[PDB]
Design a protein around this nucleic acid. Sequence first.
RNA 1: GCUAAACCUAGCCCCAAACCCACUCCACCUUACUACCAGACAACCUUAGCCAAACCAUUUACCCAAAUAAAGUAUAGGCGAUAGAAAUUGAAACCUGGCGCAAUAGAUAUAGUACCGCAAGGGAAAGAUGAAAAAUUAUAACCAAGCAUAAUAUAGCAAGGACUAACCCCUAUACCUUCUGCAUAAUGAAUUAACUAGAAAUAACUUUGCAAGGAGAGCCAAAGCUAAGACCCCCGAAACCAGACGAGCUACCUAAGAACAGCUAAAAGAGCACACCCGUCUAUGUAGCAAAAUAGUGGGAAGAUUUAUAGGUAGAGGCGACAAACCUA
RNA 2: CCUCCGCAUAAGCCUGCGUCAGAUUAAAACACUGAACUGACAAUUAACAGCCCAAUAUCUACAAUCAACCAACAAGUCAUUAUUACCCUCACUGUCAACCCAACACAGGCAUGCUCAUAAGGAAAGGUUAAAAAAAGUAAAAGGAACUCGGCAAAUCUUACCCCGCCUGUUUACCAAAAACAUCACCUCUAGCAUCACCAGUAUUAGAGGCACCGCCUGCCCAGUGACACAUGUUUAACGGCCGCGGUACCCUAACCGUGCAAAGGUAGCAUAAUCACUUGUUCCUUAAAUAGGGACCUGUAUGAAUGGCUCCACGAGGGUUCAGCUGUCUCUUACUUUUAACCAGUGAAAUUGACCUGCCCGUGAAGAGGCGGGCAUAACACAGCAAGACGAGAAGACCCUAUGGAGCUUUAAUUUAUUAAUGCAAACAGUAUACCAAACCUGCAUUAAAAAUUUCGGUUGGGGCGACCUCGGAGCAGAACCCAACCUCCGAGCAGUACAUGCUAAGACUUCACCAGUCAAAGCGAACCUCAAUUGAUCCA
Lengths: 14, 239, 95, 158
Amino acid sequence: KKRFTPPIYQPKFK
Amino acid sequence: ANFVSWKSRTKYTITPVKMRKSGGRDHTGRIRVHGIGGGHKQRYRMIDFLRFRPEETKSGPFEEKVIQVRYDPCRSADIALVAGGSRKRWIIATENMQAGDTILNSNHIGRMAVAAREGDAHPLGALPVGTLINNVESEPGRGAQYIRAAGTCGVLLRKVNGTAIIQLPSKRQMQVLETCVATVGRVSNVDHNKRVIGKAGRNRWLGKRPNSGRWHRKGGWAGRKIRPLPPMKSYVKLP
Amino acid sequence: LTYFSARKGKRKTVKAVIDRFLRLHCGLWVRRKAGYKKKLWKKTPARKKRLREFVFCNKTQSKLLDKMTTSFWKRRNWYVDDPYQKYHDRTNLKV
Amino acid sequence: LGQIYANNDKLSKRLKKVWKPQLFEREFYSEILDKKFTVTVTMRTLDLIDEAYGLDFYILKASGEDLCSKFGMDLKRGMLLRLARQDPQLHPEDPERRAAIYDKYKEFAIPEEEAEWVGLTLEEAIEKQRLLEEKDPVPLFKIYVAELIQQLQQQALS
RNA sequence: GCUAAACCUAGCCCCAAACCCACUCCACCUUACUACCAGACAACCUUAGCCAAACCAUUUACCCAAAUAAAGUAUAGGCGAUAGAAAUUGAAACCUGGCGCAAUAGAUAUAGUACCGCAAGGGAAAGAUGAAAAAUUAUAACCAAGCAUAAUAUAGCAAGGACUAACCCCUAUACCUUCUGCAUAAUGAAUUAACUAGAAAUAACUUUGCAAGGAGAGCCAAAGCUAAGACCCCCGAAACCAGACGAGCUACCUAAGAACAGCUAAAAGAGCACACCCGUCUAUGUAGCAAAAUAGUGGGAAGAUUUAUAGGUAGAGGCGACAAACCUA
RNA sequence: CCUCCGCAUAAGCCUGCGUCAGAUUAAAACACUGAACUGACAAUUAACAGCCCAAUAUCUACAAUCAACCAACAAGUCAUUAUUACCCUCACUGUCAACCCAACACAGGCAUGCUCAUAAGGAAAGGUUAAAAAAAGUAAAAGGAACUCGGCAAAUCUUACCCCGCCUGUUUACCAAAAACAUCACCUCUAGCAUCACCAGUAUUAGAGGCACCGCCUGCCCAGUGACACAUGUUUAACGGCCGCGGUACCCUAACCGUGCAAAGGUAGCAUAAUCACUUGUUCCUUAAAUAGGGACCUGUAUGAAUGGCUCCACGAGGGUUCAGCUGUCUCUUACUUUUAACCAGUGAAAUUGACCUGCCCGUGAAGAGGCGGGCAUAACACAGCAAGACGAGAAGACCCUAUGGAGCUUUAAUUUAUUAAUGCAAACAGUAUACCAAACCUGCAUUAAAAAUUUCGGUUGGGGCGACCUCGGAGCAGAACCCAACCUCCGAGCAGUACAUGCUAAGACUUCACCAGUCAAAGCGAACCUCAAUUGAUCCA
Ligand SMILES: [Mg+2]
Ligand SMILES: [Mg+2]
Ligand SMILES: [Mg+2]
Ligand SMILES: [Mg+2]
Ligand SMILES: [Mg+2]
Ligand SMILES: [Mg+2]
Ligand SMILES: [Mg+2]
Ligand SMILES: [Mg+2]
Ligand SMILES: [Mg+2]
Ligand SMILES: [Mg+2]
Ligand SMILES: [Mg+2]
Ligand SMILES: [Mg+2]
Ligand SMILES: [Mg+2]
Ligand SMILES: [Mg+2]
Ligand SMILES: [Mg+2]
Ligand SMILES: [Mg+2]
Ligand SMILES: [Mg+2]
Ligand SMILES: [Mg+2]
Ligand SMILES: [Mg+2]
Ligand SMILES: [Mg+2]
Ligand SMILES: [Mg+2]
Ligand SMILES: [Mg+2]
Ligand SMILES: [Mg+2]
Ligand SMILES: [Mg+2]
Ligand SMILES: [Mg+2]
Ligand SMILES: [Mg+2]
Ligand SMILES: [Mg+2]
Ligand SMILES: [Mg+2]
Ligand SMILES: [Mg+2]
Ligand SMILES: [Mg+2]
Ligand SMILES: [Mg+2]
Ligand SMILES: [Mg+2]
Ligand SMILES: [Mg+2]
Ligand SMILES: [Mg+2]
Ligand SMILES: [Mg+2]
Ligand SMILES: [Mg+2]
Ligand SMILES: [Mg+2]
Ligand SMILES: [Mg+2]
Ligand SMILES: [Mg+2]
Ligand SMILES: [Mg+2]
Ligand SMILES: [Mg+2]
Ligand SMILES: [Mg+2]
Ligand SMILES: [Mg+2]
Ligand SMILES: [Mg+2]
Ligand SMILES: [Mg+2]
Ligand SMILES: [Mg+2]
Ligand SMILES: [Mg+2]
Ligand SMILES: [Mg+2]
């Protein structure tokens, strides 16, 4: 199939 | 699902009441009848199907007068408002009914038959054998339900002693009590099957979605069934 | 065999071992040869007599049957009319 | 709401089956209350009524763990109150019938202070206890003038 | 010596005891944080499932009545992996701590804060001088990974043997593993600091004590009984059920509105063509403007067209002009 | 210089480039000081849209489109009456902005009015040189598609032929936008009918299905399935199917006859086609050169008449070819501008890294060596371009195989009808002269069509399926005690011809490399005086 992974955003504290 | 019906009028009137389309949505909201949805806005007319009805402080027969023949989008046949007395009620029009006509709504059954026209209405007990009738009832004082489309008509077969067998357009026999009022003649707006559609725009305007695109394999019910005529259903209650 | 139960936390036994074997106090298990009651018309009388004998087990089999049981089945019973009473104690043993 | 196997064997499929009792909408006649009621009675209830020789006996003899219904407890409490308060059941001009009815049901006679709390639930009992223990707050002016007159009488009579 | 390293207290877990609480005035069931108007309908229901029996369809402690021996005994159980009582002697009221810890440990918590989605929900690091900061003083410095101080000097898994001196002379194919055989061009790795991975029964071995008896009721015994020591890992999937959430993007429907210059207008679900609906191809980028863009060549553009507002159809399903297409990347 | 923009309304957190001090530090991709700031000062005042309507009964069929001719069909967006009671009156929500949804100050998206370019609004360029490479723009001596599978950006403006689909349209949001799904025409089946969609409808109607107009037509079948009658039958435009051989004159393709089967032994049509391999078919044309394209043939043994067969009026971002004229795709590339390229000023990554003091050849190794042997090679350190290698970077490969790890689809693979309609029985009502009738609504048992509550899909297979096998014995491999395998080559066995002392106990051994199993036998009581080589079946339960 059409394999795809969504990106993950880090918290806005670093 | 706040689904409320638009049939909120317990009094008969003449002004066309606005109706709301459904598209196959019941009280839950799921589509249960496919092929309905998206059409041109229409207005509902309160059509009085009961032919003979006495007015206030009335009992005997009364005369009527056809005024103007219009059209009803809720059905195939056309309607025509017929005035008479001190009230006006919508009834189903018949063939060869124009402006300035005179019709009779009688009820007294006579000894012999009555050579009525194709506009007036009389009980089945005073009609000759072999007469094209329409809008036949099932119970005395119930209302016309059978044979009400465009051009449909029935012919009287025979009489026994208190019943009246009426030949239905489906080639099926059906008897009814003698004290039932039925109209005489054929319904207007003939040649309805010859109406060429032309394009899908007409079907979309009428409010009919296209059929499903899934290829269904025909089972065992797709073959031709050469079956005999079903027996005559009786509505006369016998003790 | 459930080494630790959920109510008492003890050790459970296998009732099949008790119903199919018989442990003696010396450390031997008495069993029965299978097929001693089925299809006896095609077997020689010598085989029929051999199948109807109390045969002892081996070492690994006895160890397995002991591990499948607890300390209750490894005691010494003193029945009134025990036909296997003379087989509990084993004399004349030199390593 | 139980479970039933297939062909009455545990080596098949465990299906679920719920039995329903039979309901016969009949009509009775209570002698203590003198009023007919339409109750969808079953068969075991009719058998118990026939064995108890009437409906009033079946209602008054069976305890709360046998009726399994609120209407039964209400009828029991009503009959107990009618037998305790000695209220005129029918009407005057013929007290012999009422006397015979009261004499027929004399092997119980629960007092009035205990028959009013028969069949009531917890919420109804709490509501009744709150209504009995309502009492609008009495103004403190009456208590103050009572204490004042008591004090003046005590200091004057001495 | 710059970067940066340690400085204990909010307290955190379980015991014994004790049963623990909820309006200062206003607002809180409609668009909660809204002072003020005419259909009163709203609960009373076998939980299921995973695993195990090397599959799995019977079965699988979890059921909320104090210990123990009976006893894992009779029993139930594709009589098999397992489950499991009862009858019976019996069950000494009252005392304020940690052979646990100190911010990567201990509750996630200074806090259910920021942040993500319309929504249920998920959810993380924080604070170090001092008696006198109303002592802004002069000091206390010294250790890891990164740097200058103080770059390179021919030759070679960075190493060893060595001489008066770094190289020059000789030898020598990184580390753990599935593998007979691995540095192989197979797998893992940039370092430092903190954390992380062998928990336990019947039967066995050794050493005290007593002894035909041992043992603080119950159990065993033709040299036995009691006690102690000794022992059996971690992390990583697709699947199923139960309780709640979504049609604001997209599929369909409903009620009230808006949009389409100009020319040819053959009467038209006509043509070209603005704005508008979708995107057949070229070129640019794939950590870009963008988790799907840029101009034309494109089809439609008086209707089977598009759109602002409000409502409904949801998983044992919704919808479907049928792509197994869509249901918040 | 642009304006493909701006101003308002609609939706949206509400204070988000006004002043003051700090501007030493902190966010501007660098600075001034300010659209990525700390504290204090206060903007917006309604007439704009809302915040709405006292009841009892009754009334409202001649559209809009300048609505006046005409003409319709999709049959349509706007109105009151009689009675009772009511003369207190201007309160409330916002009027700022450079602003919303996408993690952002993003070349993305947003509904209507206004002049469709103006009176709204902004700057492609930081500087230095003109490296190579790449992208966007003008044209070129001769050929104008001769390069490429194909007219693939590009400008001239372009005709005819074939297939497919009637057309418009829509579908795989994000690699296929199509011949794919739909559309009017046609055909089949079901239903005698009143309140919640179907339908406020009536057998010219409604629902369930197959192709999809107009022209020629749809020839056969209930042996098998289902459906309808339970009359043994009907149904196929319901699931599906319409032969083979021999005799057959000179040559294929046969006229005809015989034979066996069955519902008929391919009807019409069309084509070497979107059509199994033979197939680059005979042949004509388009080119000088043509498995490209069109025309007449079916041995098409596998096309075929609603799984519909073919021309035809119009059309297609669907798939292929060509004619008159032209485009640097090429022979053979070139002249300029911008992005970009090289240096200066700063913010400043991502993937990736065992350490490197890192050259080549021959040969070897886990089979492709810069680190191993022998040779060749060698002062050190940066900048500017290309890819030959370091089996270089991104995804525990989507292709092959294993898994008693899953999921989707379809059943004539397994437990069962848990929910309908039909049935038969039992209780529940009421009449009825030793007999019949069993109405409307509840309960339990068993059956028939739809759903379903669950599951698995054995093993070796010189990679897997197909080929072959699934237990045991013998002959050589294994030669003279014993054991030893192959998908190495051969015979077989699932029994038998005759008496039941083919009775009961009891020392000692072999043991198919373990166990479960099998076999011989001293002696006694009892009695007159056993053959063959494998020749077979355990637990539970009955
Ligand atoms: Mg159709
Ligand atoms: Mg279809
Ligand atoms: Mg399992
Ligand atoms: Mg007990
Ligand atoms: Mg912490
Ligand atoms: Mg934490
Ligand atoms: Mg250091
Ligand atoms: Mg060297
Ligand atoms: Mg290690
Ligand atoms: Mg591995
Ligand atoms: Mg290998
Ligand atoms: Mg390696
Ligand atoms: Mg590997
Ligand atoms: Mg690596
Ligand atoms: Mg919507
Ligand atoms: Mg659609
Ligand atoms: Mg058009
Ligand atoms: Mg157009
Ligand atoms: Mg499909
Ligand atoms: Mg404003
Ligand atoms: Mg984004
Ligand atoms: Mg300006
Ligand atoms: Mg520049
Ligand atoms: Mg040129
Ligand atoms: Mg060419
Ligand atoms: Mg082109
Ligand atoms: Mg098309
Ligand atoms: Mg696509
Ligand atoms: Mg689309
Ligand atoms: Mg596309
Ligand atoms: Mg089609
Ligand atoms: Mg046919
Ligand atoms: Mg072919
Ligand atoms: Mg060509
Ligand atoms: Mg199109
Ligand atoms: Mg620079
Ligand atoms: Mg080696
Ligand atoms: Mg080499
Ligand atoms: Mg290497
Ligand atoms: Mg792998
Ligand atoms: Mg296996
Ligand atoms: Mg499995
Ligand atoms: Mg499973
Ligand atoms: Mg599933
Ligand atoms: Mg296999
Ligand atoms: Mg093979
Ligand atoms: Mg052996
Ligand atoms: Mg002998």
